[PDB]
Write a protein that holds these residues in place. Structure first.
Motif, PDB file in Angstrom:
ATOM      1  N   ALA B 298      58.758  43.595   2.474  1.00 50.28           N
ATOM      2  CA  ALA B 298      58.144  42.435   1.837  1.00 50.28           C
ATOM      3  C   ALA B 298      59.136  41.669   0.966  1.00 50.28           C
ATOM      4  O   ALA B 298      58.756  40.713   0.289  1.00 50.28           O
ATOM      5  CB  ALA B 298      56.941  42.864   1.010  1.00 50.28           C
ATOM      6  N   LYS B 299      60.392  42.116   0.982  1.00 51.95           N
ATOM      7  CA  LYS B 299      61.508  41.513   0.237  1.00 51.95           C
ATOM      8  C   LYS B 299      61.135  41.145  -1.203  1.00 51.95           C
ATOM      9  O   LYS B 299      61.514  40.088  -1.711  1.00 51.95           O
ATOM     10  CB  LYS B 299      62.077  40.288   0.982  1.00 51.95           C
ATOM     11  CG  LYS B 299      61.149  39.090   1.169  1.00 51.95           C
ATOM     12  CD  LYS B 299      61.849  37.960   1.909  1.00 51.95           C
ATOM     13  CE  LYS B 299      63.007  37.403   1.097  1.00 51.95           C
ATOM     14  NZ  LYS B 299      63.676  36.269   1.792  1.00 51.95           N
ATOM     15  N   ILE B 300      60.407  42.042  -1.861  1.00 49.45           N
ATOM     16  CA  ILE B 300      59.962  41.818  -3.231  1.00 49.45           C
ATOM     17  C   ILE B 300      60.565  42.874  -4.158  1.00 49.45           C
ATOM     18  O   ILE B 300      60.960  43.952  -3.711  1.00 49.45           O
ATOM     19  CB  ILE B 300      58.417  41.841  -3.330  1.00 49.45           C
ATOM     20  CG1 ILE B 300      57.939  41.123  -4.597  1.00 49.45           C
ATOM     21  CG2 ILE B 300      57.886  43.269  -3.261  1.00 49.45           C
ATOM     22  CD1 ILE B 300      58.302  39.654  -4.639  1.00 49.45           C
ATOM     23  N   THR B 301      60.646  42.556  -5.447  1.00 48.14           N
ATOM     24  CA  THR B 301      61.235  43.464  -6.425  1.00 48.14           C
ATOM     25  C   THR B 301      60.317  44.644  -6.727  1.00 48.14           C
ATOM     26  O   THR B 301      59.214  44.743  -6.188  1.00 48.14           O
ATOM     27  CB  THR B 301      61.563  42.736  -7.742  1.00 48.14           C
ATOM     28  OG1 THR B 301      62.196  43.645  -8.651  1.00 48.14           O
ATOM     29  CG2 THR B 301      60.293  42.191  -8.378  1.00 48.14           C
ATOM     30  N   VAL B 302      60.779  45.535  -7.598  1.00 50.17           N
ATOM     31  CA  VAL B 302      60.026  46.732  -7.953  1.00 50.17           C
ATOM     32  C   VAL B 302      59.013  46.422  -9.056  1.00 50.17           C
ATOM     33  O   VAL B 302      58.116  47.217  -9.336  1.00 50.17           O
ATOM     34  CB  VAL B 302      60.965  47.868  -8.411  1.00 50.17           C
ATOM     35  CG1 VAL B 302      60.262  49.215  -8.332  1.00 50.17           C
ATOM     36  CG2 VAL B 302      62.226  47.882  -7.562  1.00 50.17           C
ATOM     37  N   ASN B 303      59.163  45.259  -9.679  1.00 48.98           N
ATOM     38  CA  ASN B 303      58.272  44.852 -10.759  1.00 48.98           C
ATOM     39  C   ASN B 303      56.936  44.305 -10.261  1.00 48.98           C
ATOM     40  O   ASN B 303      55.920  44.411 -10.948  1.00 48.98           O
ATOM     41  CB  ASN B 303      58.958  43.807 -11.642  1.00 48.98           C
ATOM     42  CG  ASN B 303      60.189  44.350 -12.339  1.00 48.98           C
ATOM     43  OD1 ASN B 303      60.225  45.512 -12.746  1.00 48.98           O
ATOM     44  ND2 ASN B 303      61.209  43.511 -12.481  1.00 48.98           N
ATOM     45  N   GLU B 304      56.942  43.717  -9.068  1.00 45.37           N
ATOM     46  CA  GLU B 304      55.753  43.052  -8.543  1.00 45.37           C
ATOM     47  C   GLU B 304      54.916  43.933  -7.616  1.00 45.37           C
ATOM     48  O   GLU B 304      53.854  43.514  -7.152  1.00 45.37           O
ATOM     49  CB  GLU B 304      56.153  41.771  -7.805  1.00 45.37           C
ATOM     50  CG  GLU B 304      56.818  40.726  -8.688  1.00 45.37           C
ATOM     51  CD  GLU B 304      55.880  40.161  -9.738  1.00 45.37           C
ATOM     52  OE1 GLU B 304      54.656  40.125  -9.488  1.00 45.37           O
ATOM     53  OE2 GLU B 304      56.366  39.753 -10.814  1.00 45.37           O
TER      54      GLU B 304
END
Lengths: 191, 374, 95
Positions: B298-304
């Motif tokens: 999902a090419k998203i960070t670990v925060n989201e």
């Protein structure tokens, strides 16, 4: 007297209500059923008369009974739906002839056809071969027409009718101001 | 007026006497049903719609005082009348007249209100029309499930789909339209735009997550053979999941209008797809997973990812709750929905194994059990 | 289950209230429950298929009121009651 069963089929379609011919002749042929069932009552009251339509879904309004009292009341609510059906209309009667009470009564079935036949010659000659095989009396009566009266119907009757001596008769009624009563009362099948 | 009808019946255009011969023949034979059939055959023909204003009114009157043939045909031809004349003012009076004229045997009130609503679906009225539409769909739950009336109702839901108010309802009715399909007799040229706005409604539909249900029925993919495969490609990509964001970005920038504001919402819709697919991927062999694959796909960070799984639990399609202390991801029950081939193979496999195991244990136990106990 | 059964049940669907359909076997070779109660209702289909009569399975139990138990028990003199113990339980645990 004469022991036999009577099966009458009525046309519930809207072709009977047409403005050219009789004004909803359904009531007229209803009166015909009345006078012939009263005639059979005068002759042999022990005979039973069943009622069913020619439509897609076969529904018996009244089971075969010697008393037409409630039958006269069940002659109403024709439920004017569907168009016409032939094969299962035959199979719902001729095969149901075994449900009669008296086993000494002969098998007699008539029909009122006010709509063109949707079945081809194959089904016709096959069913005719079946009725000829099981040997059941059949009287073909057609009220109203669109195309030619008798074309394949002639060969249909000829192939369906066995025992030429004192066998079944064909009833063909043309257009006219006269009713259907005295017209269907002409053969020996009535009275 | 029958003898007086001959004057205007005889006089007609160049090509009219062709059908007018059979028409006047059936008129002299006084066959109402055949007359109606001839009328429908006349309407079916591409008439110039110029001097038909007389025959429309004539057949209207005839159909009014005949009280025999199905009034639905009169409804159709008067819909053609209000379509040709385009006069909504007298339309209400005409429809009310037709409703008042017909007696009570079978209920045509559903198609009557269907026509009324359809004519009221213009910019003139909206809310009340939606109300009487709800009334129409609340009318008959009975046996006449012919769905043809409900297909006209689907056309009404298309005219309602013209409004941006509710996207979800049109899709729920589009399932019914997907199931009521009969044959291919109707023009494919129309089916192009039909499947087009169907694709748009399906894509923008917020009442559905996976698009595999739309691709499930063979008739759509069979009818999309003529149309460009750009839609089939991205629909199948949404069906089998997206391991790449490139193509879905291409289909994100593919349609300019209205897709921009809903783009992020579609992303939040398809972000659960990789989740359900990855949890439905391996039925066994260490179900336990981590957020690494999720963040990579999902090419998203670990925060989201916390807000991501928060939304996942907000929808309610996943019951997953992770009791982990050290970094971990636990998974739970998920719906197969459309189909999977490897899960079918795995189904027959695990089932055969379970069956032969139960059989083996049963025979093994019962072997001594029958002898020493009975 | 024949296709004509919807037309057969349609009659009692018209004249009478909603009817329940029961399917059994002609030869009692079935070890499972011979009686399956099927209610007749019209349910909305998800695929979009036209609305038709659908038979839904309804759970059932075989029991008697008062005297029928006595009659059966007397006519049989074979079958045994619950009878908590070794054989009664282990028979179940086997078969």
């Amino acid at each position: 007297m004469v022991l036999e069963s009577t099966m009458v089929c009525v046309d519930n379609s809207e072709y009977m209500r047409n403005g050219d011919f009789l004004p909803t002749r359904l009531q007229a042929q209803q009166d015909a059923v009345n006078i012939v069932c009263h005639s059979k009552t005068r002759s042999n009251p022990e005979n039973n008369v069943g009622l069913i339509t020619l439509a897609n879904d076969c529904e018996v309004l009244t089971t075969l009974t010697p008393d037409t009292g409630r039958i006269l009341s069940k002659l109403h609510t024709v439920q004017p739906k569907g168009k016409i059906t032939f094969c299962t209309g035959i199979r719902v009667a001729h095969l149901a002839l075994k449900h009669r009470q008296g086993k000494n009564h002969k098998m007699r079935i008539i029909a009122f056809v006010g709509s063109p036949v949707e079945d081809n010659e194959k089904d016709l000659v096959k069913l005719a071969k079946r009725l000829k095989k099981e040997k059941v009396n059949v009287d073909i009566i057609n009220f109203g027409e669109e195309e030619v009266n008798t074309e394949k119907l002639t060969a249909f009757v000829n192939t369906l009718n066995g025992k030429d001596g004192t066998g079944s008769h064909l009833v063909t009624v043309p257009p006219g101001p006269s009713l259907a009563d005295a017209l269907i009362s002409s053969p020996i099948l009535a009275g | 007026d029958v003898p007086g009808f001959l004057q205007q019946s005889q006089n007609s255009g160049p090509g009219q006497p062709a059908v007018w011969h059979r028409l006047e023949e059936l008129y002299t034979k006084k066959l109402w049903h055949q007359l109606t059939l001839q009328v429908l055959d006349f309407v079916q023909d591409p008439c110039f719609a110029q001097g038909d204003g007389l025959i429309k009114l004539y057949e209207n009157f005839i159909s009014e005082f005949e009280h025999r043939v199905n009034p639905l045909s009169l409804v159709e031809i008067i819909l053609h009348v209000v379509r040709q004349m385009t006069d909504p003012n007298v339309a209400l009076t005409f429809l009310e007249k037709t409703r008042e004229k017909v007696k009570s045997s079978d209920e045509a009130v559903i198609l009557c209100k269907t026509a009324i609503g359809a004519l009221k679906l213009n910019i003139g009225d909206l809310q009340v029309t939606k109300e009487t539409i709800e009334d129409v769909e609340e009318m008959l739950n009975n046996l006449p499930g012919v769905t043809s009336v409900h297909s006209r109702f689907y056309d009404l839901s298309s005219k309602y789909y013209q409004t941006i108010g509710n996207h979800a309802s049109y899709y729920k009715d589009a399932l019914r339209f997907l199931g009521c399909v009969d044959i291919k007799d109707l023009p494919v040229s129309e089916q192009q735009e039909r499947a087009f706005t169907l694709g748009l409604a399906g894509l923008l539909g917020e009442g559905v997550f996976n698009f595999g249900e739309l691709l499930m029925h063979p008739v759509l993919e069979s009818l999309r053979n003529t149309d460009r495969q750009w839609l089939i490609d991205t629909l199948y990509a949404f069906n089998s999941g997206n391991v790449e964001r490139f193509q879905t970005l291409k289909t994100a920038w593919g349609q300019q209008p209205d897709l921009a504001a809903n783009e992020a919402q579609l992303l939040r819709k398809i972000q659960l797809l990789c989740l359900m697919e990855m949890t439905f991927t391996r039925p066994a062999n260490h179900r336990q997973l981590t957020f690494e694959e999720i963040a990579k796909s999902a090419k998203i960070t670990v925060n989201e990812v916390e807000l991501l799984v928060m939304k996942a639990l907000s929808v309610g399609l996943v019951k997953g709750s992770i009791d982990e202390v050290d970094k971990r991801v636990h998974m739970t029950w998920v719906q197969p929905r459309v189909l999977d081939l490897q899960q079918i193979k795995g189904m027959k496999d695990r089932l055969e194994f379970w069956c032969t195991d139960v059989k083996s244990m049963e025979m093994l136990v019962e072997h001594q059990a029958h002898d020493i106990l009975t | 289950l024949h296709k004509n059964d919807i037309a057969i049940n349609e009659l009692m669907k018209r004249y009478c209230p909603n009817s329940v359909l029961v399917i059994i076997d002609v030869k009692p070779k079935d070890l499972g429950l011979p009686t399956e109660a099927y209610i007749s209702v019209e349910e909305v289909h998800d695929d979009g298929t036209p609305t038709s009569k659908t038979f839904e399975h309804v759970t059932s139990e075989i029991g008697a009121e008062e005297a029928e138990e006595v009659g059966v028990e007397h006519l049989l003199r074979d079958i045994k009651d619950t009878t908590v113990g070794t054989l009664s339980q282990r028979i179940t645990n086997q078969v």
